[PDB]
Design a protein around this ligand. Structure first.
Ligand SMILES: [Cu+2]
Ligand SMILES: [Cu+2]
Ligand SMILES: [Cu+2]
Ligand SMILES: [Cu+2]
Lengths: 669, 656
């Protein structure tokens, strides 16, 4: 039952530990060591009173702390402030608290729990939640603790602010023993289609996609005191690839909505046409996340409390330095010696991570792009305002401008991939798989046609009760509308004349035509190919039939893992397929059976979605460069049909069709 | 009882009225068919739940239900403002329904039905108008608006804390929640130096209450048609701008610049840091450098281009040039000496008693709407209005004063066309005022900071009952007494109107002012009738008796009025030089003969449902100019007037 105690420390983040926690009314028995000035003279009496109440299920006795944890940096963040790692002072606070939690003796779980209880009581709730989660994920003794669903704990990061007065009313009016009716979240709450960018809202604001984004950055942080935490296998390359695929997916959606490929934000002194009014309010700070009006521009940041003292001139210098590294192929080290640039290193230089080879010279461009963009309303703290949604990993994907930032970062990576002195196009011997001939590729659907994927709209419930501070208990559901698809399978036929007895199946799709309704050049379409699955299969001699269910995708995690029915990392299964259109949009399905001898990685709970997430405590499980075979230009084909003629590759026209109907999730309570 | 039961509708406005009401645990016997759709299936259960332990059950009379289709068009969770065209239509309908109920028991019954269905801000407003006008609810006071909706008046962080106190501190003493006085901007913002005035709860309340008592539109023209309300519209806002300007000058700022070019950037942004429980959302900010943009918000039934404001402005300047307005019939109505300013006030606001609303428009009100929606002029972002959009909050915004200096500049173009008052008009033969002063360090006023409390418990929804105090810091002055020396040389008793004003000695560039300038900075301190014997008289008048203010404890309905703690400007540490002015005019020529009224605060608020109790122009004797633009206040003075140099000394100290 100690693990239940750890899980409870997630509950109701804006409540003190004076009163009970959880659906089951569990009391933490406080002592003098666990008081705060706010409750210095009455705290224990109040805690006694709350635990003496009728419905209290049990009381947790805490082990005495022999030494009081010290938090000299982190104690400076007020409890009613908003927390972001893009602020240098907040990163330092996080490293301090993580270090404390990580330092507790292995297997001393009563000491650990008391240390975490102390941290929670004395620290900002967002900061505590982040640091506690990082510690739970990285310690060796906390394997059995479930990190509580982030949308249940901080639902304000995921909802429409207008849900909350209704939620408080429902919890107050209807007793906890009687079901409360779900509160329906409108499809159009941040805007209507009067705003063209609003057409993508269903995707940008998707809870599953924003949860994934949050969990990815949790698994792959750019900073820690322990380099071991940051230096997971090929994280720099994965930073590139994951975001490149996010941009590819968003671009697929844009073309399904009469919009163009997203425009990179590269001219950093120009005004920014995209507005965004996120409708989110912080329950921690009581503040609306400041919006962005059309036509704002970056301004030099002078926010010494945040640790932000950086100019546009600085950003332009850093970018010149990075562009020079790409142009020469060499990075300059602090001692003035050089080293050859590779994609992993460039990912770390760009982010930046603590693994950058020269942070003094190359700065931290991507992190500062977020900063600059989040503070255009208050760049020098004149207005006592905080950062916009673009500065929080759980909310950032909601903002259209996130994609302009990442289009530019991706363009930087592509300039490296497209430069022959940095990256060489694949040779025939790198692409081929001698003796393996793909003879057909199809998708099939139960109740569906051959080569048609069918999408529709679904309403699903999330419980916000755990995040609703000072409410009565019992579930309170918000019912939100999201994209989904009818289940399908791939059927791939191949004749194996030779000796291969295993292969990696790599599946990608891309729209058949561009914004002009014209066929693509492969040099452009390669960046539009979205990876759908990647998995090793045996091959027999002669005829093979490979069948793969859409539910088996190594990209995704199931609904029941994203939401309550590396656990949280993974693209949500309901967003695997682009929306398409009511009329149907032609897509191209590309399948490759690659040479396992060059794929293989030789190495010795929930679903692990390795494509974006890699594997806990292991090497990224594919030896190829991430995005293979489309990560770089072709030297012998200018279109996908010519590229696909190779024996081990297949290509098939498909149609994505939207059925514009809304159905309830069968998993709803 | 039914009458007094109405007061329960001001308790916990977001809680359905089938829940326990007040601190005394009372319930209404809400009939099953009144329950909102979402609760109808559980109505037996809920009724039992909230009736358990209730100290008293209040019966609800069966009535024929009114058609609420019109007022139900406003979302339950939207903001409400009369500035918004569709909100005028909906409020008039609901007021009309409340006014039409035959008796108070029927009114209670329809109120319970509406409370469960109608936007709580609109419900509050319409119930308050009905209570103030129904003959059967006379002598019922409206519970203070700031304790019903306290989130309109303080940093949203206050409510975080208050909700924690209410739920966690379940026994023993509670400390008041601290209300931060400085919160909307940094020190590095010049405008922040006078935030203590803009964000003052008493000032914002006066603004709410004034507009509540003098609405520009309503259910019947007779609610709007109060005595000289057009002129009072002018005057009350002229005095706000005067007061604000003094305050600016005490804090090293130049006087407010009018927003007279509607196309110009608004350099001063404002981030209100307010949150609404009813709307479940924070108030939107206005970023620095924002502009008025063409409006087309279907939901608000507002559609109008910025260009239109220029058209309306030009039409006003033309009417003032001709001293005459175009009428619907194609003829012209003079702007006459007695009623001209009143006509102009109604033309400008505008109100339903505007002589020609079709032509002259709705200039002042649309200004609020333009300013309120610069961020979302066509509703594409589904945003609500900024604080300029609501009369409870508009004074918070530095832009309010820019708009009102523009509006006052227009009224002043007319005022300066009037013939200067002749000596005979001004003089009171037989009465010579030899001196005026303030008793004590004589002729010195002291200001400082003071902490006072407000109760949050009535307005904090879905929390335990019990007192939750918040403590706010506001400007305050020491009380004082005027001394006026007057010779009555006539041989018999006379009645006078004593009129007391103060103005800065110098302008924003530290220079002495002409009368024509300084007169606009004369802030009213008092107006009272006084008996005068043969020959010498010493009049002593207490600061607490001011005809301009209401007392702290104040906040029959008697809630309009300048807050007493803001009677005098902040002044400065070194001592801020002002001139104290007194005139005694002939009461025979000022009085209005008329009949149990709350006659508190008549200077800016008049007297509810009576004639404004002074025949002279509002702001007499300073509303007109002198012919000579180089003439000074000393040149103005007639024998029935006196001036005294005074100092306002600020102590940066705080008392309780
Ligand atoms: Cu990311
Ligand atoms: Cu980013
Ligand atoms: Cu007003
Ligand atoms: Cu106004």
């Amino acid at each position: 039952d100690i693990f239940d105690s750890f899980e409870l420390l997630y509950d109701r983040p804006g409540e003190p530990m004076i009163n009970t926690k959880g659906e089951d009314k569990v009391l933490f028995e406080l002592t003098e060591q666990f008081l705060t000035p706010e409750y210095a003279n009455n705290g224990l009496e109040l805690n006694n009173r709350f635990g003496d109440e009728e419905e209290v299920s049990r009381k947790i006795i805490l082990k005495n702390l022999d030494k009081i944890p010290e938090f000299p940096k982190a104690k400076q963040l007020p409890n009613d402030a908003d927390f972001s790692l893009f602020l240098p002072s907040h990163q330092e606070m996080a490293n301090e608290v993580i270090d404390v939690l990580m330092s507790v003796t292995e297997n001393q779980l009563q000491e650990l729990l008391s240390t975490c209880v102390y941290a929670r009581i004395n620290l900002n709730p967002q900061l505590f939640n982040y640091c506690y989660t990082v510690a739970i994920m990285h310690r060796r003794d906390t394997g059995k603790v479930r990190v509580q669903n982030y949308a249940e704990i901080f639902p304000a990061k995921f909802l429409d602010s207008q849900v909350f007065t209704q939620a408080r009313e429902a919890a107050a009016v209807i007793p906890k023993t009687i079901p409360r009716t779900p509160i329906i979240i409108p499809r159009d709450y941040t805007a209507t289609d009067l705003e063209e960018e609003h057409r993508l809202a269903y995707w940008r604001e998707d809870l599953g996609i924003n949860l994934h984004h949050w969990h990815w950055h949790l698994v792959y942080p750019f900073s820690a005191s322990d380099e071991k935490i940051v230096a997971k296998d090929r994280r720099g390359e994965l930073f590139f690839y994951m975001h490149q695929q996010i941009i590819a997916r968003y671009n697929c959606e844009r073309l399904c909505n009469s919009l163009k490929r997203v425009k990179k934000f590269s001219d950093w002194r120009e005004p920014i046409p995209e507005a965004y009014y996120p409708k989110l309010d912080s329950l921690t700070s009581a503040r609306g996340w400041p919006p962005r009006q059309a036509g704002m521009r970056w301004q030099d940041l002078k926010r010494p409390v945040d640790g932000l003292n950086v100019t546009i001139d600085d950003m332009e210098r850093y970018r010149r330095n990075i562009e020079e590294a790409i142009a020469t192929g060499n990075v300059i080290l602090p001692d003035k010696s050089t080293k050859k640039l590779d994609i992993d290193m460039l990912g770390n230089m760009m982010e930046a991570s603590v693994l950058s080879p020269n942070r003094d010279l190359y700065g931290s461009i991507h992190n500062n792009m977020h900063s600059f963009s989040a503070y255009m309303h208050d760049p020098e703290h004149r207005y006592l305002e905080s950062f916009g949604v673009i500065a929080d990993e759980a909310t950032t994907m909601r903002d259209p401008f996130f994609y302009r930032v990442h289009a530019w970062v991706d363009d930087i990576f592509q300039s490296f991939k497209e430069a022959p002195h940095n990256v060489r196009p694949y040779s025939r011997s790198q692409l081929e798989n001698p003796g393996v001939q793909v003879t057909s590729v199809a998708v099939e659907s139960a109740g569906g046609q051959q080569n048609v994927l069918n999408t529709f709209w679904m309403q699903s419930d999330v419980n916000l009760s755990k995040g609703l501070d000072f409410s009565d208990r019992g579930p309170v559901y918000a019912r939100f509308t999201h994209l989904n698809h009818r289940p399908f399978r791939y059927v791939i036929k191949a004749n194996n004349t030779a000796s291969a007895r295993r292969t990696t199946v790599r599946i990608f799709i891309a729209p058949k035509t561009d914004e002009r309704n014209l066929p693509w050049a492969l040099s452009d379409q390669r960046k539009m190919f979205i990876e759908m699955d990647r998995f090793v299969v045996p091959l027999s001699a002669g005829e093979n039939t490979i069948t793969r269910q859409s539910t088996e995708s190594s990209l995704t995690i199931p609904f029941e893992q994203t939401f309550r029915d590396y656990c949280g990392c993974g693209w949500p299964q309901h967003m695997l397929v682009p929306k398409g259109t009511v009329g149907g949009v032609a897509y191209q399905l590309f399948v490759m059976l690659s040479n396992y001898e060059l794929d293989k990685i030789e190495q010795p709970s929930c679903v692990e979605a390795s494509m974006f997430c890699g594997l806990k405590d292991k090497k990224y499980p594919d030896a190829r460069p991430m995005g293979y075979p489309f990560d770089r230009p072709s030297n012998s084909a200018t279109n996908i049909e010519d590229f696909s003629a190779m024996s081990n590759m297949g290509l098939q026209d498909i149609v994505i069709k939207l059925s514009d109907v809304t159905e309830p999730n069968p998993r709803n309570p | 009882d039914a009458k007094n039961n109405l007061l329960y509708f001001f308790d916990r406005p977001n809680e359905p009225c089938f829940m326990q009401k007040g601190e005394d645990k009372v319930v209404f016997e809400i009939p099953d068919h009144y329950y909102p759709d979402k609760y109808k299936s559980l109505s037996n259960t809920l009724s039992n739940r909230f009736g358990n332990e209730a100290t008293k059950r209040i019966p609800i009379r069966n009535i024929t239900l009114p058609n609420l289709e019109v007022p139900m068009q406003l979302p339950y969770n939207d903001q409400f403002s009369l500035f918004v065209p569709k909100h005028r239509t909906m409020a008039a309908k609901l007021i009309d329904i409340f006014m039409g109920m035959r008796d108070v028991e029927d009114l209670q019954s329809v109120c319970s039905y509406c409370q469960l269905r109608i936007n709580p801000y609109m419900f509050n407003y319409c119930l308050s108008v009905a209570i103030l006008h129904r003959p059967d609810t006379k002598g019922l006071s409206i519970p203070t608006f700031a304790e019903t909706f306290p989130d309109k008046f303080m940093d949203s962080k206050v409510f975080l804390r208050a909700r924690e106190v209410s739920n966690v501190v379940i026994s023993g003493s509670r400390m008041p929640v601290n209300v931060p006085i400085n919160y909307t901007a940094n020190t590095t913002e010049p405008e922040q130096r006078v935030a203590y005035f803009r964000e003052d709860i008493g000032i914002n309340l006066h603004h709410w209450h004034w507009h509540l008592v003098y609405p520009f539109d309503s259910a019947d023209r007779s609610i709007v048609n109060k005595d000289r309300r057009g002129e009072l519209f002018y005057y009350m806002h002229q005095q706000i701008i005067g007061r604000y300007n003094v305050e600016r000058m005490c804090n090293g700022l130049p006087q407010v610049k009018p927003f007279s070019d509607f196309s110009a950037p608004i350099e001063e942004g404002y981030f209100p840091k307010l949150d609404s429980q009813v709307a479940s959302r924070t108030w939107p900010p206005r970023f620095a450098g924002s502009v008025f943009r063409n409006l087309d918000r279907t939901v608000d039934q507002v559609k109008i281009d910025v260009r239109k404001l220029f058209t309306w402005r030009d039409q006003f300047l033309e009417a003032i040039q001709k001293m005459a307005i175009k009428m619907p019939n194609g003829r012209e109505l003079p702007l006459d000496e007695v009623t001209g300013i009143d006509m102009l006030g109604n033309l400008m606001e505008s109100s339903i008693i505007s002589p020609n609303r079709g032509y002259y428009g709705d200039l002042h009100n649309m200004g609020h709407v333009f300013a309120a929606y610069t961020h979302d002029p066509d509703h594409r972002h589904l945003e609500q209005f900024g604080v300029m959009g609501d009369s409870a909050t508009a004074m918070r915004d530095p832009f309010f004063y820019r708009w009102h200096r523009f509006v006052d500049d227009v009224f002043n173009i007319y005022k300066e066309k009037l013939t200067p008052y002749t000596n005979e008009r001004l003089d009171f033969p037989g009465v010579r005022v030899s001196s005026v002063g303030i008793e004590g360090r004589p002729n010195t006023l002291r200001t400082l900071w003071q902490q006072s409390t407000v109760e949050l418990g009535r307005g904090l929804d879905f929390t335990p009952r019990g007192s939750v105090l918040a403590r706010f810091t506001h400007l305050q002055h020491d009380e004082f007494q005027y001394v006026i020396e007057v010779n009555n040389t006539t041989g018999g008793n006379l009645m006078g109107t004593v009129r007391i004003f103060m103005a800065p000695k110098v302008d924003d560039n530290g220079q002495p002012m002409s009368f024509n300038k300084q007169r606009r900075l004369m802030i009213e301190l008092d107006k009272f009738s006084q008996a005068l014997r043969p020959g010498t008289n010493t009049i002593r008048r207490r600061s607490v008796d001011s005809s301009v203010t209401i007392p702290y404890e104040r906040t029959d309905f008697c809630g309009c009025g300048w807050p007493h703690h803001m009677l005098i400007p902040k002044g400065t540490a070194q001592g801020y030089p002002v001139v104290l002015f007194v005139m005694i005019s002939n009461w025979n020529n000022d009085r209005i003969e008329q009949d149990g009224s709350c006659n508190d605060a008549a200077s800016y608020c008049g007297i509810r449902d009576r004639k404004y109790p002074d025949k002279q122009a509002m702001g007499y004797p300073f509303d007109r100019k002198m012919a000579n633009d180089a003439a000074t206040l000393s040149d103005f003075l007639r024998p029935n007037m006196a001036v005294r140099d005074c100092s306002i000394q600020f102590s940066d100290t705080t008392v309780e």
